[PDB]
A = this chain, B = another copy of it.
Amino acid sequence: EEDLTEVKKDALENLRVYLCEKIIAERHFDHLRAKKILSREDTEEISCQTSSRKRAGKLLDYLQENPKGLDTLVESIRREKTQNFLIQKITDEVLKLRNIKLEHLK
């Protein structure tokens, strides 16, 4: 429907509570993967002056604008050491996305 991109942002915002847990790996993951999408300076803006949680908040705020908010998901499969739980997170993400999709169908 070309609106699943929009509902991805809503799913992200509903899931922004789970930021604190596993976006501590923000620089660990996205600064090296999502540079395919994220701006180079944006990594510096995220990292330079924040307090390591709000830092992830700004990361996800930059992510919402992109329609491919599944880029973090795709990166998450990489570095499978963290994925034992972060795949639990991708399942949580897919569950929220499915709930919002079911609402979208109405």
Contact = CB atoms under 8 A, between A and B. Distances in A.
Given A20-B65, A39-B82, A42-B51, 12 more contacts: A16-B35, A19-B32, A24-B61, A25-B42, A27-B54, A32-B57, A35-B81, A39-B79, A41-B53, A44-B52, A44-B53, A48-B51
Main secondary structure of the interface of A (DSSP, over half): helix
Interface of A: 10, 13-14, 16-17, 19-22, 24-25, 27-28, 31-33, 35-42, 44-45, 48-49, 51-54, 57, 61-62, 64-68, 78-82, 84-85, 88
A69 to B, nearest CB: 10
A37 B82 contact: yes
A78 B41 CA distance: 13
A32 B44 contact: no
A81 B36 contact: yes
Contacts of A25: 39, 42
A80 B40 CA distance: 10
